[PDB]
C-alpha cells in the first residue's frame, strides 16, 4: 500500500515536470522562430 | 531545427501516452490491494 | 512571455515541493519495509 | 509484479522525459549561439 | 524492499532532471531578455 | 553561459548513468520477485 502510494506520487511529480518541459519547449520554439 | 522540431513532437505525444497507461496501471493497483 | 514565466516559476517550486514530500513516504518505506 | 510493472512504466517516462529534456538543450545551444 | 531503493534512484533522477531543467529555463529567460 | 555549459553538461552525464543504474535495479527487481 506504501510502495503503490508512492507510485501515485512519483507519477504525480514527474507530470508535473512534463507541463514544465512543454513549456520551455515551447519558450524554446518561440524564440526559434523569431531568431530564425 | 526540422529535424528536431519533428522530434521534440513526438516524444511530448509519446510521453502523455506514457503517462495515461501510467495513470491507468496506478489506479488498478489501487483497486488491486483492495 | 510574463504569464509563462509565472508559471516556471511556480511549477520549479511546486516540483520541487511534490519531491520533499516523495522523501517522507520513501523514509516509511524504507522503515516499514524492514 | 504489477507494481515492478508500474515501476517501468515510470523508468520509462523519465527516460523519455531525458530525450527530450537533451533536445532541448540543444536548442538552447543553439539559440545561445547565434543570439550572441 | 528491492521496489523501495528503485522507487529511490527514481526519485533521484526526477531530482537531477529538475536541476537540469531549472538550469534549462534559466537560459530560456536570458536568451529572452536578450532578443527582446 | 559558460558555467551554465559545463553544468548542464555534467548533469546529462549524471542523469544518464543514473538512468541505466535505474534499468538493472527494474532488471533484479522481477529477477528475484520468486
Known amino acids: 500500500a ?3 502510494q ?3 506520487q ?4 514527474v507530470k508535473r515536470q512534463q507541463e514544465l518541459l512543454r513549456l520551455t519547449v515551447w519558450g524554446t520554439k518561440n524564440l526559434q522562430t523569431r531568431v530564425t | ?3 528536431w522540431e519533428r522530434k521534440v ?3 511530448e505525444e509519446n ?5 495515461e497507461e501510467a495513470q ?3 489506479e488498478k493497483n489501487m483497486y488491486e490491494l483492495q
Not at chain 2, 510521453?15 to 503517462?19: C, E, K, S
Open chain 1, 2 to 4: 506504501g510502495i503503490v
Open chain 1, 6 to 8: 508512492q507510485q501515485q
Open chain 1, 10 to 13: 512519483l507519477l504525480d511529480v
Open chain 2, 1 to 3: 531545427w526540422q529535424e
Open chain 2, 9 to 11: 513532437d513526438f516524444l
Open chain 2, 15 to 19: 510521453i502523455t501516452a506514457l503517462l
Open chain 2, 24 to 26: 491507468i496501471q496506478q
